[PDB]
Symmetry: D2
Subunit: 47 residues, 4 copies
Amino acid sequence: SDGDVVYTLNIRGKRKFEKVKEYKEALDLLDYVQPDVKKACCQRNQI
Amino acid sequence: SDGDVVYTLNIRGKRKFEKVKEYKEALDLLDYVQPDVKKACCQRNQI
Amino acid sequence: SDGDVVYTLNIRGKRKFEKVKEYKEALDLLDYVQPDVKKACCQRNQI
Amino acid sequence: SDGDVVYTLNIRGKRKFEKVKEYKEALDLLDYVQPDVKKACCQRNQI
């Protein structure tokens, strides 16, 4: 249910942000695509 | 391109691992689903 | 030198943010405490 | 009490790993240095 609560994360440091933002993008995509793509992803490039 | 180079990450601590593990899944997914779903994701649940 | 550049990351979704926010805190901490604590941390709970 | 349980995370992909490993490093540090350093970090480079 908690997927639209805009939680701002002011990350001081560009390089630092690049890491975190990569995680937020990844989390947003995790919460985006079908659960089955995750299974197929598991056997695509995951371990 | 480095997406199939098995890099083991021994994460001591269950709760800790749970955080990283989802990140690795999220990253695996970032490199999995079509770039267009990421665009649509941007307008689905991203900011 | 990019460690003090405020890069806002609006993370929609509480649970999502909780993960990334802990990552930004963790990164901010990586970029804070003494380098020797990292060595000791490496052998404290890191692998 | 879950900070010393070795949970291996085989991250396929170097670039991917660099991100997650940075998270695990950061998480390990979060559970390492004193909670007061986090407070001071908060007002050192955190937002």
